[PDB]
Structure formats: structure tokens, C-alpha cells
Amino acid sequence: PQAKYRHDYRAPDYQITDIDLTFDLDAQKTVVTAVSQAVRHGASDAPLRLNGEDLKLVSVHINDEPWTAWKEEEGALVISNLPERFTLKIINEISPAANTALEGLYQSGDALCTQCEAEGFRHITYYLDRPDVLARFTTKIIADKIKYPFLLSNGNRVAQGELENGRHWVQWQDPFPKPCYLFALVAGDFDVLRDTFTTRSGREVALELYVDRGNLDRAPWAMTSLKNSMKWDEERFGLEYDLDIYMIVAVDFFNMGAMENKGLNIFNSKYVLARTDTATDKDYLDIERVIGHEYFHNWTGNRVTCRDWFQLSLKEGLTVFRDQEFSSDLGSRAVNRINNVRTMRGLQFAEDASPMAHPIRPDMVIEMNNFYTLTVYEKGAEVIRMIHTLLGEENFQKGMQLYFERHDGSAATCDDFVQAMEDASNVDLSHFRRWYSQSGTPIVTVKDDYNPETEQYTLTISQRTPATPDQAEKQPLHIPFAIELYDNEGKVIPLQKGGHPVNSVLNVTQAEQTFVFDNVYFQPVPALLCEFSAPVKLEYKWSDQQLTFLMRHARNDFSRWDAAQSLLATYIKLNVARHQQGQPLSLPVHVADAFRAVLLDEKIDPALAAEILTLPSVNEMAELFDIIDPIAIAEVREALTRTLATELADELLAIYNANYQSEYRVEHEDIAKRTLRNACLRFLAFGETHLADVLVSKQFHEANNMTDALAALSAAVAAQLPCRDALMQEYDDKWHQNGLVMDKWFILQATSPAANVLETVRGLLQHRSFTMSNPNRIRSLIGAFAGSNPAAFHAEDGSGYLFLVEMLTDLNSRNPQVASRLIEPLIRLKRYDAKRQEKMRAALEQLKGLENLSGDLYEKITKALA
Ligand SMILES: C[C@H](N)P(=O)(O)C[C@@H](Cc1ccccc1)C(=O)N[C@@H](Cc1ccccc1)C(=O)O
Ligand SMILES: [Zn+2]
């Protein structure tokens, strides 16, 4: 298919205002009858062009007249010579059982369910499958009662009946006009957890969580999180739910985390099912954030939707911002910010440095499913957060209110959102808008000067964004650049100039500019880009002592973690260079000293300590380098772990023991202590072998929760401890029947430092708990290997690339969306040495020649080979 361009947007020639659907459901052959009320808006001679994929057309009527003026073409049904207003009736067949791509109506175990975003509804019937067409849906579902006792679609049950031959039916009406990507249908046999939330104005909402039979023991936390999400959106954003019923269905087979279908969200079971023996603290907090995310889409996505798919970030950047604010308000703001900055620097910057680079509002798309990206989501949220930084909470909320006032019940654009924020706040965002249009990561360079004669501190700040493959032209951005200045006692120095206070958020809008601060009585230590105030790379020539000073004194916990990152970066870079010359780790004494001080500091929040004591991942480390040496990075990461383990052995054990908790609670203070304890465990695993082996095996066996059990198992694998094989087998024996739990074990197998990792991974394709039919299994074994074990994936013999090619050859046909997620590591080839590039190019060329190459892979392969 050809690329589509944002600049080609044109209003639809026809709208559909109302659609009545009937599904005669069966896994082999489903018959869809769709009755649409259409209204022409364009030229009177314009044909109606309906999108359709893999449909068997049965009939076409206009006002009940069999229509002869139509033609089917690739991906379309084109209907000519129509009245201005008419009733379209389409009957067509589809085959859910044959739908391995999991796009449209498909089978998940014994259940039938849908996924329609972005363009899945056209796999169900011929329709105006574009998000600026908003219709009122009524959905009648007819099915075998024994096999499908629950028949669900969006909105409220308005009719129901029984039929001969053991069939029954239910009809649903959703009063809110919607784009078809928000359509959902679910049929199957479920256990149901039912509860209620009463809104602040008194609306009683029925909450219903549908899970596979036997999974009720894993449902209450998700339900609790839904209620928490509802309450928070009221308190923080002043938003209430707008329907009578809120349904969530947890399904096993799903190509995303979850989906905000109006009143009938469909979730990957990973983001619903939890009990303390199956789920970790991280699972609990992820369920919380994804339940929140889907709930928050009700306003930011559904009540206001997207005019076209290039505006995806309008809902995704804003909804991610909302889920981050939810998690941050309920939990540790510092830990959430830290985690989101690790994702930005370690994963999103890599995308912005890749052949797939795009602005948060893309200009060119071949396959829209390829644009559900770290950029659109996470950088999108950073852009929303910059607006929040520039406006402050009160004006930001005024902007939110104006946005909803203007655009409720419509399909809007990124520009509409920015305009609402500007108009509500009187803050000029004209230059700021360039963040929507420009790809790549800006680099902000800071030079400073303290003048004792004048008691002035001057920051000379410059910016540039390197060219990206998609954009030869780059321009300066409006960068909110937050600072704080500290005296030698760690006290904040008031920012001022010429007898007036200066805002700590500097407006870095030029290629080069200077900022002068007076009444700086003594030489300051600066904290720069506070709370990661803009998604940029910072270049400032820190001394080690400035950084350790900030670790001790910075007022925001984020700054203390960030200073530790800058300190480590220097020595990670040093030691990778040493590795390449066959030299062992070298680290100045004062560095281990800084981490010792973190361990022994009584005043530090355990939440913060735990994150400082969590070394950057191999993907985070890769972004420190122009050319990635993934073997050096992996070995340096282990060497650094071992060195700190040795130098801090006593302190690590003291803190490990001090943070023991006999009670298991999913509560933030407890989670912090446990995260610290297990951060210590990572290092303790690299102590004297017998001592480490005993400690690790003890934790695995004595654990009263999965967080602690998994931490121990992970350490046994990381440090290749004697107990590893026993613990791994014990886990398999206990948990093989549980796919979500086995995913953690597949991840450990895939990311193992063992020399035989690829052999093991290949063997696990035959494991009883693995299947190529399940996206979660694929991601946990194959994705984890390719993406989270770059040292093995990039083995010099090219074996990792060949393995991935085999897997992608299958998945290109089976499930292109999952295939396209999995190909990402191969498209980073230009970051690697020449020998690696050659092998990766050969792999990509093999894939390029596949019979029936998917558009999903074609788009990425083309860019990677350019
Ligand atoms: C496509 C839906 N409209 P969604 O709700 O945005 C899906 C989203 C749910 C989620 C939110 C927050 C954390 C984790 C999951 C989702 O799956 N996003 C993924 C990325 C993604 C994967 C596959 C398809 C689409 C997006 C992510 O942010 O990690
Ligand atoms: Zn979303």
C-alpha cells in the first residue's frame, strides 16, 4: 500500500449518523447485517467509498432496493448514484476462527471478542472506517446460548430474547455517537465480579468485570483500581463517568495491553489478573495504571476523539499523562517520574535516533498500527507535561475545561488541544507547537560562569536537534528548562535579576541565549533540567563532586536520582572503552562512597534509595554511545554490579535485613521497602558464591509473595548461581499451567547471561507453556530475547538475527502486528559496527523478499534498508 499523508486530510463525502448491527454469531461463519443511516456532505456526484478487508459480501440495498450501482475494489466497496439521505443495508460474512491477526472479530480461547483500533472495524463490515465519522450504534447479538451465555456490546441492554434450537439474543444501545474504532463485541462464558461506584453527583454506576471461569480469585484488585480511577478523575480533573454500566472483559489473546471501547473495555488479562502468589508489586501497579489509562480515555479519547489517525497523540499523549498523574498522586511521584524518565532516555530516545523516527503528530504513515509508539505515547505525554509546566495546574485545568467545552461530542486535532490551552491561559504556545511537528531529540548544552566581582551567575544555553532520516530541516524549540541553585550548605538561592524575582522555568527558545542571575552571593551548584522538564539530552560538564553534592542536598528526589545517573554515565563510558581494550573495571573510590552513603542514609526515602541502587538497564546504557557495543555494555554492567557488591557487601546485607517485612501489603510504603530490599539482593547475588547461593535460595523458598520469589529467581539467573537450575525447574513445575506467571520465567530464560541462551530459547519454542498463537508468550520469550538481551541477540556469529528471521517469517503471516513489534531490534542496525550492519541488512533483505509481506513489516524494512 501507498503511504498516506497528514496534509491530505479531507472531510468525508458522507457521514453515517446511526448504525444498527446484527451479528448471527458463530466461530466458523458469522453473518453481519449492518443498517446505516447515511447523509451526503460532499459533491452530489460523489460515490460512497466504504472500507472493507477480508469480507464475503452477501448483498447491498439502498432504502431496501437491491443496489446495482456498486463495485468492489481492493480494500473497498464503492457505491454510486446515491440520494442525499438514505438507508444503507450491507450483509456480509466473516470467519472469527480464521482470524489469527486478532484484528476485527476473532476467537480468544472459547470466547469471541473484537479489536477495532485503528482500522479493525473494516474487517467486520464495509464501513466509513475513519474516526471523524461518529454514529450512534445499536448492536443485536444472536448466538448459541450454551457456548455464549454472555453477549456484550457497548452501552445498555435494551432488548433480549430466546430462539429455537438453543439460541438467544441481546440488543445493546450506546447513546453516544462514536467512531467505529470504539465498537466492541464479546461473547462467551465468564465469571463476573460485580460492584458499584457512586459518582460525586450521585450517579450509581454498575461495574462488571468479566473473566474466564476460575479467575474470580484474581479480579478484586482490578475492580478496586477501577473505583480508584473513577474517584481520582473526579478529584483531579472534575470528570465523572457518563453511563450506567462500566464493563471490562479480560481476554487471553490480545495484541495490546487494553482498549477503551465505550462502556465495554477489553483488556489483555496481564493488566487485570492479580493475586499475591501470581503477581508482583510491578504487576499490581501496572494493573492500576492500565485500568486508569482505559478509564481516562472515556474523556480523552471517547467524549473527544481524533479527527484522523495522525492525531493519535491527542488522545494517547494526554491519556498517558493522565495515567502518570494518577499513579504519581496515589503512590510515589518521584519513583513514577524516575521510571518514566528511564523509559524516555533509554527507549524513546532510541526510537527518535532510528529509521522509524517521527514527530508525536506523524506526517506520513503506511500502516497506522506501526504508530502506537514510544514517541506518540511517552514523548506525547512529555509534551503534555511541558504544557503543564508552562501553564501551572490551575491554568492547565482551565485549558482542559475549555477543550471539553469546545470539543465534547466531536473528533478533534492536536492543534485544537493546544489552542484550548493557549486560549484558557493566555500563554503563547505558537512556538511551542513545533514540538508536534519536529522529530528527534534536542540536545541542550549548558555552560556556566560565576562572577565574584558582580555576584552574578550566568548560564549560556544552546540547543540543536540533529537531522533525522524523516526530516532534513530542524529548528529551535520552546524548551521549558527548570533550574535550581544551591549554596554550599544545600540551601536554595533565590533566583532574581535587576531587583525582580525570575521564574525557575527558563524559556529556552533560541539556538543560543544567556540567562543572568544576580544576588548570587556565593558560587552555586546548579540542578539543571529539573524533574526532566523537557524531553532533551543535557550536556553540562559536571564535576563528580557537584553530582554527589546534589545526591545529598537536592530538594526534589528526582534530582538526586538524576545526579547519580550522570555520575554513573561517566564511568559506564570509561569502562566500556576499557572493555574494548581488554581491561578490567576501574572506578574511583569516591563513586562507591556515594552509593555507600545512599545505603546508610537514614533520612532518605527507601523508594528513592531503591532507584539509585538500581543500575541503568543495558538499553539505557546503549544510549550513552554513538556506536553500541552490546557485549561490552552487558559485561560492564555485570562488572559494575560485582564491584559494588564487593565494596558494599556489609552495608547491602544490613539494609537487606533491615527492610524485611513479614506481612505482605500492596501499599506504597511497603512496596518501597521491598523494592529497596530486592535492589540490595541484586548485588548480594554477586557476593561469595556459597553465601549468595544460600541467601537467594532461602528468599525463593521462604517468600510469601511473588515479588520476593521472582526477585530471588531473577538473581539466581543473573549471577548464574548453583541453585539456578533447581529454582527454575521448581517454578516450571508449580506454574506451567499459568501463562501470565510463566511469562516471567520466559523473560528470565531469554535475558539469561548463560553462554547457551539462544539454544535454550530455541528449545523453549517446544515448551508446554509456550505457543506462537499467543502475543504474550511471543513477547515474553522471543521479544525479550531480541529486545532485552541485545548482547545475545547481537552475537558476533549472527545467530540472533537468523533466529529472529525464522520467527518473523511465521509471524508475518500469522499476526503482522506482533511481528512488527518484534522486528524493532533489527531496524537499529546503523547503531552497530559494520560487520553487524552487514548481517542485519542481510536479515532484513531476506524478510523484504517474503511472499505476502505484510504492510506492517514492509514499512519498517523499507526505512531500515534506506
Ligand atoms: C491502543 C489503546 N487505545 P491503548 O489504550 O492506548 C493501549 C495501551 C494500554 C496501556 C496503557 C499504559 C500502559 C500499558 C498499556 C497500550 O497497550 N500501550 C502500550 C503500547 C502499545 C502496544 C501495542 C499496541 C498499542 C500500543 C504501552 O504504552 O506500553
Ligand atoms: Zn491509550
Side-chain angles (χ1 to χ4, degrees), residues 117 255-258 260 290 293-294 315-316 372 377 821:
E117 188 179 2
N255 283 345
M256 58 186 54
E260 68 269 24
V290 177
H293 186 98
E294 301 308 329
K315 70 180 180 77
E316 298 303 342
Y372 284 74
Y377 279 68
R821 288 193 87 181

Side-chain angles (χ1 to χ4, degrees), residues 639-655:
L640 184 53
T641 302
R642 287 180 177 278
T643 295
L644 292 169
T646 301
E647 297 304 317
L648 312 172
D650 291 337
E651 296 86 350
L652 290 162
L653 183 59
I655 297 312

Side-chain angles (χ1 to χ4, degrees), residues 211-265:
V211 299
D212 286 346
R213 292 296 188 169
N215 279 333
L216 280 175
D217 67 342
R218 286 199 283 179
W221 172 245
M223 180 66 79
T224 302
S225 293
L226 179 54
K227 298 187 292 190
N228 288 340
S229 299
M230 294 176 85
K231 189 69 166 88
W232 178 88
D233 219 1
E234 292 183 343
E235 295 177 357
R236 184 79 185 267
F237 279 81
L239 298 169
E240 290 192 20
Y241 190 54
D242 52 352
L243 286 168
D244 318 76
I245 174 62
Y246 199 105
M247 299 174 275
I248 294 169
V249 184
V251 301
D252 191 18
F253 294 82
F254 208 63
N255 283 345
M256 58 186 54
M259 177 66 214
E260 68 269 24
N261 316 292
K262 183 76 174 194
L264 175 54
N265 295 174

Side-chain angles (χ1 to χ4, degrees), residues 764-779:
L764 295 170
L765 296 174
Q766 307 311 318
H767 191 280
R768 58 197 187 284
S769 309
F770 181 82
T771 176
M772 294 291 283
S773 64
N774 185 288
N776 289 47
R777 300 307 96 74
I778 293 161
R779 290 198 75 258

Side-chain angles (χ1 to χ4, degrees), residues 5 35 570 617 730 753 857:
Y5 293 92
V35 179
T570 303
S617 71
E730 285 167 30
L857 292 190

